[PDB]
Write a protein that binds this ligand. Structure first.
Ligand code: ZN
Length: 190
């Protein structure tokens, strides 16, 4: 579906499968939380789809080769996770895997806890990459991997944007319990 723009179908596939699989693990109650025990079960965790236009704005960040969050106006209505590795020539699907693990690892390493309301104390804990990956209402994913001179630079963008101050990361409860369209094996809503 997407343009022949330097991004591989293998990396796109890896991004999307990694996000949905890790959203599923959270939703089912299987994700270890460094605050204690596991992340709570999610009532209506939505499945993500790959979006070539979101990819295009992630690309506009990655292609500049500066490790930096974009301004909202450069990614209107989108959230953003960024990652770098010093291995410039890394295979792009390997880089998709490493970045997705790095972001998700905020939950095991730093902790979130049972209270999922996104407060300033929570944001400052350094878990904002993990919260954007598992943000319930975020349903579109687009990413780009750029080989720069001194880094492999990975940007993923997310629509609608997550990490809204004051809102819950996701609604807690039994997997699929607030879903009419459910994949009961993954605990994801379609
Ligand atoms: Zn960040």
């Amino acid at each position: 579906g997407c343009p022949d723009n330097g991004m591989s179908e293998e990396a796109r596939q890896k991004f999307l499968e990694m996000h949905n699989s890790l959203r599923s693990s959270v939703a089912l109650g299987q994700a270890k939380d460094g605050a204690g025990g596991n992340a709570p079960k999610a009532a209506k965790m939505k499945t993500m789809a790959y979006d070539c236009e979101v990819e295009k704005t992630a690309m506009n960040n990655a292609k500049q080769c500066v490790f930096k969050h974009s301004q909202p106006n450069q990614r209107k209505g989108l959230g953003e996770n960024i990652f770098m590795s010093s291995d410039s020539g890394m295979d792009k699907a390997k880089a998709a895997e490493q970045a997705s693990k790095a972001w998700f690892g905020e939950l095991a390493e730093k902790g979130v806890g049972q209270n999922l309301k996104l407060t300033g104390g929570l944001f400052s804990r350094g878990v904002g990459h993990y919260t954007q990956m598992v943000w319930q209402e975020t349903v579109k994913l687009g990413c780009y991997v750029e080989a720069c001179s001194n880094m492999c630079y990975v940007v993923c963008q997310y629509g609608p944007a997550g990490n809204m101050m004051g809102k819950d990361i996701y609604e807690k409860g039994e997997p699929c319990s607030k879903c009419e369209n459910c994949d009961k094996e993954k605990g994801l809503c379609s």
